[PDB]
Design a binder for these strands. Structure first.
Ligand SMILES: [Zn+2]
Length: 273
DNA sequence: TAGACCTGGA
DNA sequence: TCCAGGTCTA
């Protein structure tokens, strides 16, 4: 899940939990809880608080309670669902927040990579993991100027730059490869070798891609679905991600898949330079 | 940067 | 065995 997916999850989840009061918190896999470290302290402090809001920061879900904020990262497979406490639990459900109305927020995560941090509302943003987080791609905080200032200060791939949450927030493997394709830039090329026109083109593409992905409800390429188990529709507008060995939608040239920044990387050998 | 941190699907 | 919408590390 990246900005689009998390944003979609956030939108479909909020109305289902807003106003509900946490009566209990069950943890079936303690490692997911990062702060406080003690899974029992994490549970105990949630008890009694009401969900007042659900915000997003980068790829993080920020559950706003009474005095605390629950910072949740779905990582690769984290998923939330709201269901009746009387129904059996689905597999890989590691954390369940029981509400006083008998319903419950269930956190499923097959790979168990997700993380949860609870801090007093005020502390949340100045503490990790939200502390060291780049600006929102859909806000004036993210400008070609910002991307430029970071590109010139590094010799690493423009892909590694974009995948860096400190540079810009919310971009993952799918949207980085897609934005770079749409900007006509090879992902493996040095970030500092990007010209002012390219950087202003990339920025424009990134912002455009993220926005469209948000409208289409995110990209369902493997296991992603919004809170209602509904798949997104942006995967049908993907140019390169996961299309290796398939003709490029623009030029017909077979899409390539290599490894860049340690990640599977897709691109058109002809349309990107 | 090759692995962790985990687990299921091709 | 190879791979994965995330992210740190030796
Ligand atoms: Zn092409």
């Amino acid at each position: 899940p990246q900005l689009p997916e998390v944003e979609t999850i956030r939108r479909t989840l909020l109305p289902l939990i807003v106003g509900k009061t946490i009566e209990d918190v069950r943890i079936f896999w303690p490692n997911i809880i990062r702060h406080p470290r003690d899974s029992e302290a994490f549970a105990a402090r949630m008890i009694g608080q009401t969900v007042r809001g659900l915000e997003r920061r980068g790829k993080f879900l920020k559950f706003l309670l009474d005095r605390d904020a629950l910072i949740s990262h779905l990582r690769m497979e984290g998923r939330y669902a709201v269901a009746s406490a009387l129904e059996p639990l689905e597999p890989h459900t590691h954390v369940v927040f029981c509400f006083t109305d008998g319903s419950e927020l269930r956190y499923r995560d097959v790979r168990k990579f997700g993380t949860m941090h609870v801090y007093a509302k005020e502390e949340a943003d100045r503490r990790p993991p939200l502390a060291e987080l780049g600006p929102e791609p859909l806000s004036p905080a993210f400008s070609p100027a910002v991307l430029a200032e970071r590109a010139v200060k590094t010799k690493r791939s423009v892909k590694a730059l974009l995948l860096d949450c400190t540079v810009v927030a919310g971009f993952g493997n799918i949207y980085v490869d897609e934005s770079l394709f749409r900007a006509g830039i090879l992902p493996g090329r040095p970030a500092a070798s990007l010209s002012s026109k390219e950087i202003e083109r990339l920025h424009e593409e990134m912002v455009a891609t993220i926005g469209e992905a948000v409208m289409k409800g995110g990209s369902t390429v493997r296991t992603y679905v919004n809170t209602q188990g509904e798949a997104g529709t942006f995967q049908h507008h993907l140019y390169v991600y996961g299309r290796q060995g398939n003709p490029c939608k623009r030029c017909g040239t077979p899409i390539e898949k290599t490894v860049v920044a340690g990640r599977g990387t897709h691109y058109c050998p002809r349309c990107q330079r």
